[PDB]
Every structure is written in C-alpha cells, then in structure tokens.
Amino acid sequence: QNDEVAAFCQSIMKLKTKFPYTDHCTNPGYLLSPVTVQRNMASVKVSIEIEGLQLPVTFTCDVSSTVEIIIMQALCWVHDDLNQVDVGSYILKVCGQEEVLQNNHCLGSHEHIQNCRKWDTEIKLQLLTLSAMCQNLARTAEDDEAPVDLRNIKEAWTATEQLQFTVYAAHGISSNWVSNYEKYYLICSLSHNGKDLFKPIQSKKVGTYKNAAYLIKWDELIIFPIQISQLPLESVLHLTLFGVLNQGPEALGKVSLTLFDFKRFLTCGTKLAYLWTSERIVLQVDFPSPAFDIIYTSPQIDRNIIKLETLESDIKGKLLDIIHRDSSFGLSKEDKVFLWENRYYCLKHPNCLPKILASAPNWKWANLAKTYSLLHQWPPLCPLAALELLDAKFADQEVRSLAVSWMEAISDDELADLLPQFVQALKYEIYLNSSLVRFLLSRALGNIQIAHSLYWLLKDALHDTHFGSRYEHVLGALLSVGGKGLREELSKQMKLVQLLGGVAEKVRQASGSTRQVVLQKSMERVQSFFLRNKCRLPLKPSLVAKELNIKSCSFFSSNAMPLKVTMVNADPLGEEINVMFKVGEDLRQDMLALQMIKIMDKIWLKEGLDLRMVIFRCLSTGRDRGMVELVPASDTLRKIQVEYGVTGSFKDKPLAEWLRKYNPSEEEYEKASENFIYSCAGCCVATYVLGICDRHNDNIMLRSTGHMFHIDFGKFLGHAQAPFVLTSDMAYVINGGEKPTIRFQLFVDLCCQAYNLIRKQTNLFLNLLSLMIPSGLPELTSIQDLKYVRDALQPQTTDAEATIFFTRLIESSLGSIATKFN
C-alpha cells in the first residue's frame, strides 16, 4: 500500500506538470457557465452592464449567436469602431454570479439563458475584462511546485501451483460479539469481472481462542481448484466473516484482496486485511512464500490486419439484428456465440463492442491475445457507449484503459452531469493508480466545476464500509492538486454546511413555540461565520454569500423541518440567495432521480424537443443531510386544490383559476397553459420510465409560470405497482375548455415523441443506473431493477407501436373522464 501510494503520488506530480498555473485555459480561476448544446441554433433580450455607462445596454440577440459576437455587439453599442478596442480581452459574466459565459458557444446553449427564457426573466449580464474578473480560485506557482501529499522471477503462465492460502486468525473482537455469537466462519470466494470463478469455499466454525476473547484463530488451509497460471490479472479474493448466534448466521464484515499487486507480482507471505463494523478488526491470511517471485506477464501481441471474408444474408440479417439491439442486456447465449464468431464483421459499428466483449467465451490467458488484437484495431466508441466498459463486468485493464481513452472525447459540460457514475466506477478499479482516476483528476484540474462536484461526491463516497480508504486517497489527491485557493474555498463551504446542519438539528429537537426562537438564536453562529468569511454557496458555487438575512430565515413546518436559508449576495448586481437545508433523510436517491430527469431533458433538447422542464439542484452534503434549490412561486397541487376548494365546487377548475390569477391577460394565460402542456408531457414520460408511481397531490408541484415538476422521489424504480394520473383539472388546462381540443392531440404527440427519444437511448439509461447500483440506494440493488426500466422502454417494439402503447397509457391515466376523449 505505502509503495502503491508513493508510485501514485509520483504519477500525480507528473500529471501536474501538464497544467502550469500560467495557462489560463486550464487554470481560469473562475467557474464556466454550464452549457448544453441545443439543435436549431429565435431572439431574446439581454441587458449588459458596461464600465462607465450608468444604464446597462439592452438589445435583442439571436439565440444562435456565439457569446463572442455578442460581446462584440455590446462593444459596438459603446464604440464606433473596434480598430483599437482590445476585443479579445473581454468576457461576459452573469450578474451576481461568478461564472463566465463561454465565448465559442451559442448564447442559447447556456443553461442560465435557457432557464431565463423558460422563466421569462431578465437576462442580466455584465461585460468586463479578464483583469476585473475574480480569479481567487486560481492555482499559484507555489501550488505547482508543491509536493503532493494524500530474487528470481517466475512468469505466472509457467506457474503450476494451486491457488491456496491459510486463513489464520481475526484480531480485535468486541465484547458485544463475544456475548452474542458462539462461533465464526469465513466464506471465501474468488472473482473476476465481478463474477465468481468457482463455488465459494466455507471455513470451519471456530469460537474465540483459549485465553483470548479478542482472537478468533482458524489456522485453516483453503485450496481453490485453480492454478496460478489460470488466474486473470485482476483476480480478487473475497472473505466474508459470519457469526452463528448462541441463544440464521449473520454477516459481520467483508474484506477483499487482490491476488496480484499493482506491479504484477503475485501476493506472497502473510497479508493483513482490515474490516470495519462501525471499529477495526484485523484478519491475517498467510499466502505461500516460495524462494522466487511470481509475476504476471500478458501474452504476446498478435499483429493482424482484419475485408477478406465470406458473406451471406440469412446470417448477415441476424447479425445486424443483434448489432442494432437495445443493449447487451438479456442477450441470449446462442446470440452471444453467434456474435462472437462473427465479430470481425462488426468493425464498422464501433458502439457494439460492449456486446462483443460480453459474448467472449472466457478470459483465459491463452484467449487474451486474440481479444487484445481486436481491441487495438477497433474504431473509437462514443464516450457514452464507452461507459459500459467501466462497469463491473469488465475488469480487464486493457479494456478499461482503452475505454478511458475513448472517453477523452467527451466535453466537460456533459461529463459534469455524469460524475456520480464515474466516482462509483472507481470501485471496479482494483489498483489505486488507474487510467480512470487520472482521467478524472485531469478533468478536475482543467475545470473548476468538475473539481467542486468531484469534491462533494468523493466526500459522500467516504462513508463506504468497504471502499472508504481508497476514496480517502483519491480525495486527498484531488485536494492536493486543486491548489490552496480552491482548498480554502471548499473549507469555508464545509464549515458552512456543518453550522447549518447544527442549526437544523437544534430546530427539530426543539418543539412548538420554542422553535423559531431557537432558530434565530442558533443562527448567531452562522452570522459570526459570515462576519469573518465570505462564502460560496455549495449548491451553486458561483453565488457568493456575504451575510445571512436573519429575518427571512425560517422553517417549513413539514416532515424533517427543512430550513429556509436566505443569504445576501456579495454582488449588488445579483439577487438574494434562497436555499433549503435539510437534515435526516437521504438525498442521494433524490439526486439520482433528478439526474435522470436532467439527462432525459438533455436528450430531448439535442433532438430539438423542448418540454420546458424544471431542472433544480440538490446536493448531499453528508450523511442524511444536504441543501436543495428552492423553486420560487410554486405550490403543490393539493394546496391549489384546497385553497380554490373554499370558493368553488367546479371539480376541474382549480389549476386554471390559480394560473389565471398569476397570468390574467389572455396571452399570459395561454402561454402558461402551453408551458403546462409541455412540462406535463415531460413529467408523464419521466414518471413512467423511472417508475416514480408515488405521484399524488403532495408530490406534484406547479410553478406560477405554468411549469409542472416533481419534488419528491420516494418510490423510485418502484415498478412492482394507471402509471401516472391525469385528473380533470389538468385536462381542463391542457384542453383550454371542458371538451377536447387539438391541444390534447399536441400533448399526446409530445408524450409519444419524447418517449421514443428516450427508448433510442435505452443503453445509456441502463448503464447510468447499473453504475449507481454499488452506491447503496435501497431499491436499486440488482440488475433486476434495470430490467423493469428496460421493459418500460419496450426496446424490441418499433416507434409506431411504442406510440400506440404510450397513447393507451395516457387514456388509462384519464380514468372515468377518458370516455369524453377519442
């Protein structure tokens, strides 16, 4: 471990050398404003503050214009000719947010622009030079030159010795264990590619040793029916410790051991493993210790150039049927062998390589040379497709390194929203230094948003009972390489989340009349914090808070008593910061639901379908606590139904009247109704595919602009289970009347269109969810959960039949009032 850590640190300094503090492109010192490229790149109004002008210039821009020419248009308003105006010295930033628009991207591609348009709120930018932009987070020269802190040989293929090891003892047993358990045993399993190579082997059941209740001694030899020369390089031994009660046996802990170390040497001699149960226990397994070191050597390369082969059409039809399948999921055994034999015909369809590798008959050393030979004459995959190659089922390091090399094509903006799965895929790298971790660290060096999100994600990952140590090394590398500016900023944000969490705990423990007073008094400590510190908001680190608005702070009087934290912007050009902080309930599953909704939205927008979706932020900042974006001027459907229900008996006019009071004019009410149509279509498709069937008056929320969204994702992937529901007031808003109109047909067409656009990306959604399996969410625990989503996506069906299917889902959701529609 120490020597692996040292080699890791050497490599990481080598990675640092490639990001000097002088290069502004990779060391900007500011956040980049996020972008999601949208097709068909319509006009909007933008107001731009300019130095020397008392009023900002306001003018109409083409949504499809790049930020560069928009800067020049703003410069043209103030100068008659740009001959001696330093045009390249200028940037645009969002008013009140320390994020900079990206020059080479369309104004319409930027998320801030897109939200403002959905919102119809003022686009308020500011023109300045790089010199005036805050670059406090930038790395110094100091940081660059600082160090990072966190005899004979036998080739393995010639090694005939059985794999064998002696499970010797476990040291450190607790008093609670001695009282509750008589005896103990280990179950030993041997795995590669996340799959058992053989039946697991169970040890004898022994009690605590004589005159030692902290010691469990087995001194037992365990032999597996395999030789050293048959072990894949990435073979892992799993030891799970069990306790049989004295008064079913229950699992006390688990350790894993790689059979080869990061330098290809076979594990030899005594080896100590550590398992935690809350405390640390030490297992000792003794491996054989011959007079020679055994090293793994990969088979030697095949050089081949493979256009020159048979053809046929009974076979070629079946083959292209396999290639265009949704995924490798559920691929039958016959299909696997058929594809494997025909694999060299597939070379002009790169994104089917994961199917091909999943159809390999085995990963025996002898069969590796022909796989490797294929892999290095294979075309580049698209990054999203290469995700599958980083899942558990592909442990081979050539495969994974090659997948990371294909991943390098992905943009930072796309990668930012996929980081959770990458952090999880770290668990399938057996060694500390890997292509993948260096890729992630490299991206975090060149982009502050990626570094910030990686920070918070690794910080959750630390609570893993099995992988926490590895994540500590990775997080220490991120913090080391990030520089002192970023480090002190993250420290301020960490202290802020701790202080806010303390306030929330005190508020919940307090009750009734002594609760808001407890709030106000407990916020004193955070007020002190701001008195000595200006702090970036962890949810959106481009917002700088200087002070707490103690007056507007309150609680929501709901389950888990959430805090409404109101903060003063440090920028006068910006507006208040309002975030909810919540303690008690686990926000990671809400984060996964939100991320899936965001990815569906991205997919739609890339195909030119804008369903006007509400995409709000949520950040787990610890064990069962975090902070959540607050969508302004929105209320739950029941709240609307009942506040209307005191004045009316109409059954179906509450939502329409609610929207009418905030959109009185006819143009404004039609616009709000249209927003409702589109956002509701998006919500229905998401409800069905992601299996969120807990929808009810309290779960669905509606914004005064007319946009509908979800806020609670308690039953997520609950496909056990009218998938969604369309009560009559929603139908009234969509129709505009009490009878069906062409607006309902537009809603049905929008739903089916979006549904098919997601069915086309079934592989991405299956891969994005399986990569989250090992994160430990209660109800994404197996590949079976993925099967339910795939069945919902109906992969085999055509787009036309899928349209028919979803249309009848809609009319099922309409219930009794579905008689009135065609």
UniProtKB/Swiss-Prot annotation:
Compartments it resides in: Cell membrane; Cytoplasmic vesicle, Clathrin-coated vesicle; Nucleus; Cytoplasm
Region of interest: G-loop: 555-561
The organism's place on the tree of life at top rank: Eukaryota
Span of domain PI3K/PI4K catalytic: 549-818
Domain PIK helical, first and last residues per copy: 307-481
GO molecular function: 1-phosphatidylinositol-3-kinase activity; 1-phosphatidylinositol-4,5-bisphosphate 3-kinase activity; 1-phosphatidylinositol-4-phosphate 3-kinase activity; ATP binding; clathrin binding; phosphatidylinositol binding
Phenotype of gene-disrupted mutants: Chronic renal failure and kidney lesions. Affects podocyte morphology and function.
Keyword Nuclease set for record: no
Region (Activation loop): 710-727
Keywords: Acetylation, ATP-binding, Cell membrane, Cytoplasm, Cytoplasmic vesicle, Endocytosis, Exocytosis, Golgi apparatus, Kinase, Lipid metabolism, Membrane, Nucleotide-binding, Nucleus, Phosphoprotein, Transferase
Post-translational modification: Phosphorylated upon insulin stimulation; which may lead to enzyme activation.
A single GO BP: endocytosis
One Gene Ontology cellular component: trans-Golgi network
Keyword hit for Kinase: yes
Family: Belongs to the PI3/PI4-kinase family.
Role played: Generates phosphatidylinositol 3-phosphate (PtdIns3P) and phosphatidylinositol 3,4-bisphosphate (PtdIns(3,4)P2) that act as second messengers. Has a role in several intracellular trafficking events. Functions in insulin signaling and secretion. Required for translocation of the glucose transporter SLC2A4/GLUT4 to the plasma membrane and glucose uptake in response to insulin-mediated RHOQ activation.
Subunit structure: Interacts with ERBB2 and EGFR. Interacts with clathrin trimers. Interacts with SBF2/MTMR13.
Name used for this protein in its record: Phosphatidylinositol 4-phosphate 3-kinase C2 domain-containing subunit alpha
Parent-protein residues present: 378 to 1387 of 1686
